Amino acid sequence: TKKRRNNGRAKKGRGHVQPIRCTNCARCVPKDKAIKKFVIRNIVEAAAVRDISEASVFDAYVLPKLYVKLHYCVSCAIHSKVVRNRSREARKDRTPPPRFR
Amino acid sequence: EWMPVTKLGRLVKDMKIKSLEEIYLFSLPIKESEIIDFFLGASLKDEVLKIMPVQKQTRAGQRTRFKAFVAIGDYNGHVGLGVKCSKEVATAIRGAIILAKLSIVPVRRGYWGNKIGKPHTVPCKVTGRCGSVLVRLIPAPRGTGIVSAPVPKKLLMMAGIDDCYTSARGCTATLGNFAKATFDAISKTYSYLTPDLWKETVFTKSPYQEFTDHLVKT
Amino acid sequence: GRVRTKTVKKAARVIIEKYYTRLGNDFHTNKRVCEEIAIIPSKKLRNKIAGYVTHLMKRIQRGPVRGISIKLQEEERERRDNYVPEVSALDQEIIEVDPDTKEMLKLLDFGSLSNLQVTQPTVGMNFKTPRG
Amino acid sequence: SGALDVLQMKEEDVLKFLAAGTHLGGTNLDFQMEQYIYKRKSDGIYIINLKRTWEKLLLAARAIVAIENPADVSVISSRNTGQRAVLKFAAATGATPIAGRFTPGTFTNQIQAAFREPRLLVVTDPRADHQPLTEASYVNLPTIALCNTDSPLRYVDIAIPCNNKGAHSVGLMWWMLAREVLRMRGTISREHPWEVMPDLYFYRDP
Amino acid sequence: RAKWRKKRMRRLKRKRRKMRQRSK
Amino acid sequence: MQNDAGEFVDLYVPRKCSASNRIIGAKDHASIQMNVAEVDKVTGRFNGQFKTYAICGAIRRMGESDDSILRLAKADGIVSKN
Amino acid sequence: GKCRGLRTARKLRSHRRDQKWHDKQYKKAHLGTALKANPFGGASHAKGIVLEKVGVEAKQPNSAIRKCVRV
Amino acid sequence: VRMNVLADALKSINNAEKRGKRQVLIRPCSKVIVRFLTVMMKHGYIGEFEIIDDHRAGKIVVNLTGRLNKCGVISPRFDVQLKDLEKWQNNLLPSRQFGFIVLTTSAGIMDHEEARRKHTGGKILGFFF
RNA sequence: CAGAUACCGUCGUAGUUCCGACCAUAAACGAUGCCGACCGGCGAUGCGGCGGCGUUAUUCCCAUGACCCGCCGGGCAGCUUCCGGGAAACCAAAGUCUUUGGGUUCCGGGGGGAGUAUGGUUGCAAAGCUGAAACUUAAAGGAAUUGACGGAAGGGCACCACC
RNA sequence: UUAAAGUUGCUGCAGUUAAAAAGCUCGUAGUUGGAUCU
Ligand SMILES: [Zn+2]
C-alpha cells in the first residue's frame, strides 16, 4: 500500500531528474530523492584553537571555515542516524528539527 | 422502582409526557429504557439474530468475548436494533436488549395504489447502506407479503410493514451489516419529503418549556 | 522516597475543606484535632494525614489551591472581586481614532462626538512576517 | 432592535466601545464573518461594524430573555480573561457559570457528577470553548458566541462580532449583555444608567 | 523472482529454435 | 398521510427546517428550536410573546445557521434594516 | 465509460460477442475442445468392460483407500 | 465539448439544492430548458425564474424552494410509445403517488399524465421527483 | 567462507562517446485514458495583465526596473473540512451511483498451466506483436486490527546485573 | 439447460492498491455534436 503522497521525492510536473552519487556508497540517487546536508565547519576544532592562536603571527586573525554539501541515499541516512523513522502522523511533519534553538 | 436521572424521565414518570411521538417530534435523545418500557411495554417483542464470538490475541493465548444482535418491535410502526459484546452470553443479551429499546424509531407506512384502509407498505422506494451492503425497499401490492431474505424479513415484520419487495447488493453474509442496512432504510421513511408533507410546520412548545414550573419544583 | 498516597491526600483535603477554622500551622495541634473528629486507624496513618494538612495549610496563605474550596476563602475572593476604581478605565477625555474608523462612525451618525481625535495612520504597508 | 427608537444604541455606549477597542479585529478574516466588518485598514487590521455588533447583541439578549428558567442558561469561559465576567453575569441574571476547564461528558454522560441539561448556551470564544460547543450538538442546544474576525461559525447560531481577545473588550461585552437582559426583563429602568460599572467584569494581571 | 523465471523460459525457447526446425 | 375517506393515517407529522425546508428526523440530535422574545414598541420590555425558528443539524454543521437565523429575524422585523 | 448513442447497437452487440469468450463456462460449452476430450461424448451414462481392480489412496488430511475399478 | 445543454442545466439545479442554496444560475439558456423548467414549476417544485439576455445564448436564474429530491435527464432521447410508458415510470419514478416523467410529443413538452390524457407518445426528455 | 562460481579489492574485453542505419521494449507510474459542466475554505508560488500609499536605481522630468498591498486568467503543487464517496487505506476527486443515462476510445471476468505451444507477421540477429487447449486446484488475493518476532530506532529498572 | 448471475451488466458491473488505462501523439471509417426562425 502507498506510504507517502509524494512517493518519497520532490518530483512534481516533470518526467526525469538527473542522478547524483551518494557521498558514502557512490550510489546513483535521483537529486530530488537524496538526503542533502550543508555543513559549514571549522578547519581546527576547539581542541586545537588554543594551540593555534598562540602560534599565529597575525593579531586578531580569524580562522577559516569549510563548506561541504553532502548527498546521501535513503540507506546511508538511516544507517548513519542522519534520518530516523517516526510514527505515521509524525511522518507528515516536515519542519526542520529544532537545532537552531 | 424507576428513579429517573434525566429531565425527560422525570416528565414521563409524572404523566406530563403522554406519547412517544411527542418525544420524536422534537428529536430529543432518549437515554433511559424505562421511558420506552413506559409507553410500549406489553407491545414489545424481541429476537436474537446472531451470537458472534470474537477474539483478541494476547501473550497468553486468545481472549474470547461474545457479541449479540437483538431486534425489537411492537409490530405497529416502531422498530429498533441493538448490539452488545460481553464476556458472557447472558450478560451480552441482557445489555443488547437495552440498546435495542433505546434505538427504537418510528416507521412510515404508505399505499401502493388506491388508499382504502390502513397503510400497508413503504411510502416510496428507500435505500439503506452499511459497509458494502445495500438494501432497497420497493412498495408492493396489498397481500403480496414481504419478498425478502430471512434476515431483513424479521425487522420488516417487527416494524408493521405487511408488503414490500426487497433487493440486496454486496456481502450480505455478514448479517451484522445486513441488518444495519435494512434498519437504516426503515429509518429513512420519516426523512423522505413527499408532497404530503409540503405544508408549513406549526411550532408547538417543547416539553422542557411547557413543564418548566413542574421541573423547577421537582 | 517519601511520597504520600491518594488515601492520605484525599483524607487531608477533605479535613481541610471541612474544618478550616480549627486547623492551623502547628503540626502537634492538627495532630490532635484530627483524632478528635476523623475516625482514623493507628498513629502512623493519623500522622501522615496531619502532616500533609500542616504542609498544605502554608500553601493557602500564599493563595488559593486547585484542590480545596473554603467558603471563607470564597468570601475573601469575592471582596477582592468587588473592586472598582473611582474613575473607570473607559471614561477618557480623548479617544484616539483612526481615519478609517471615523468614516464608520460617520455612517453611524456619530460625527458629532467631541472626545475623538483622528490620528495619522502608518504609511509603510509592512505588517507581514518574512517567509522562510 | 426592530428599528425602535428606544432600542437604538447611544453615544455613551459607542464611546465605551471605542475606548475598549471592540471595533478592532485581527489580521485574518473568516469567510463567514465577512458581512460583519466595515473595511480593512493599512497595517492590515479589520474593523468591525458596531451597528452590526449592537444588532447581534440585542438578538442574543432576546434569545436569553425567552428562556423562562433563569438557571437553564449556562455561560462558559475557558480563558481567565472571561472568568470574572461569567461569574458576574451569572450573579446578576441567575444563569449557571462554568469558568475554567470543561469536563468532557458534562452534557452527554448522564451518571457523572456535574451533569447538566441546559436550554441555552453562551460562550466567550468559539475557538477556545470548542468542546462545550461541539458537545452541544449531541443534545439539541442553541449556541450564542462572542466572535472575532477569525472565528469559525460551526454550531454557532448567534455570533456576536466583537474583539474577543482584549480584557476590556471581553468585560464590556459581557457587561452590555447583562445590562440588556435585565432591561429587557424589566428589573432595571431604561432611563437611569446602570449603577454597576464595567470595571467589575474586567481581568487584572497579578 | 519472476525476472529470473522469465530469463529461464527464454533460454529454453532459444534452444528449442535450434532443436525444432523446418528441416526436422 | 390521509386516505380516500379523508382520515389522517400518519403516526406523527415531523418538523421542517426554517432554512432549507428539510425534514427534521427523530434522531437528528443536532437540530435546534429557538425562541426569540418580542418587546413592546413603547417601553421595550418583554411582551410575553416570541417567535420560533427550527434549524437542522446539516445546516448548522455547514456553518450557515448564523446567517440563516439573521435572515429569518430580518424577515420578521426583529432585526433593523441593515 | 461505455458508448450510449442511438446508433450503437452494432458496437454493443460485437463487444458482447467478443467478451463472452472470456467467460470460461461459455468458452468450455461453445468451443468444442471439451466435448472431444469427454470420454462419454456428451452422454450421462456409458457401458464398459472391467479391466482391473484398483485402489486409490485418499488425499490428505484423510487417510484411507478408496476402492475403484479400471473400465 | 458541451453536448446536451439540458443535461448541464439539470445537473446544476440538482447539485445546488443538495447544498441548500436559494438560487441557481444556468448557462446557456435554451427553449427546451425553459419548457422543462416550466413543467417543473407548474407542479410546485421550483418557483419563479428569470431569463437574462446577452445577445447570445442567455442565462437563467432559478429560485429553489427545497422541494426537489431529484431531477435528471435521459440520454439518448428514446422513443416511447403509449404502451411502453408504464415500464418507464416503474423504472424511473419512486412511487405511484408522486414523481413525473417529462416527454416531448407533437402536442408539446409535457409530463407522462398529460400525455396519457391526450393519447400520444413521444421522446423521453427526463424526470423529476 | 564449511563451501563463493557472490557481496570486498587489483586489473581488464565488449560497451560507455560521436557519425549513419536497425531494434520498439521499462515499476515507459500519478500503478489513475481524453473532452465538457456543477460542487467548501486558506495561505503561498511561476507567467501575463490591471490598480494602489510608500522605500530604492542617491539626490530632479516621466516612463522603466528591484521591493510593498491587492484583483483577474491560465499553470506546478500545499494545508484544512462531517461536500460527498470508499472494503478501507484514502480521494476536492477516486465526488455529483439502486434518487442507477453528458460524449467517446481501450481493456477485465477465481488461482495455475501461460504470455507457454502452434499458425501468421516484422527483424541481420536478439527478439517484438497476435495468442490456446488438454490438464490441475478451494482458495489465491486486497485493506485494516490485536499479538509474536526483527543481526530496526529510542527510554527505564535490578548486588539472584555490572562498576 | 433456465433462474439464482447486478459472476457478460441495454435496463445494470468493473479498471489507484483485489483481475485490469495502449509509452505518447497524429489520423480515415464508425460514434457524438452549441444559441437561433409563431
Ligand atoms: Zn549511500
Residue numbers in the entry:
A (entry chain a): 2 to 102
B (entry chain C): 59 to 276
C (entry chain R): 2 to 133
D (entry chain A): 2 to 207
E (entry chain h): 2 to 25
F (entry chain V): 1 to 82
G (entry chain X): 2 to 72
H (entry chain W): 2 to 130
Paper excerpt:
Nsp1 is a critical virulence factor of coronaviruses and plays key roles in suppressing host gene expression, which facilitates viral replication and immune evasion. It has been shown that Nsp1 effectively suppresses the translation of host mRNAs by directly binding to the 40S small ribosomal subunit. Here, we report a bipartite mechanism of SARS-CoV-2 Nsp1 which operates by: (1) hijacking the host ribosome via direct interaction of its C-terminal domain (CT) with the 40S ribosomal subunit and (2) specifically lifting this inhibition for SARS-CoV-2 via a direct interaction of its N-terminal domain (NT) with the 5’ untranslated region (5’ UTR) of SARS-CoV-2 mRNA. Upon infection, SARS-CoV-2 hijacks host cell translation machinery to synthesize ORF1a and ORF1b polyproteins that are subsequently proteolytically cleaved into 16 mature non-structural proteins, namely Nsp1 to Nsp16.
We determined the cryo-EM structure of the Nsp1–40S complex at a resolution of at least 2.9 Å for both the body and the head regions of the 40S. The Nsp1-CT could be traced in the cryo-EM map, which revealed a tight helical hairpin. However, the MBP tag and the N-terminal domain (Nsp1-NT) are invisible in the cryo-EM map, suggesting that they are flexibly linked to the CT. Nsp1 interacts with the 40S at the mRNA channel located at the interface between the head and body of the 40S. As such, Nsp1 binding blocks mRNA entry to the ribosome to inhibit protein translation, in agreement with recent structural studies. In more detail, Nsp1 forms interactions with three 40S protein subunits, uS3, uS5 and eS30, as well as the 18S rRNA. It is worth noting that three out of the four binding interfaces are between Nsp1 and the body of the 40S (uS5, eS30, 18S); only one interface, at the most proximal region of the Nsp1-CT, is with the head of the 40S (uS3). The Nsp1-uS3 interface has a buried surface area of 283 Å2 with mostly charge-charge interactions, and is mediated by Nsp1 residues, including D152, E155, E159 and D156. At the interface with the18S rRNA, Nsp1 residues H165 and K164 stack with the bases of U607, U630, and U631, while R171 and R175 form charge-charge interactions with the phosphate backbone of A604, G606 and U607. Overall, Nsp1 is highly buried, with close to 60% of its total surface area of 2,400 Å2 interacting with the 40S.
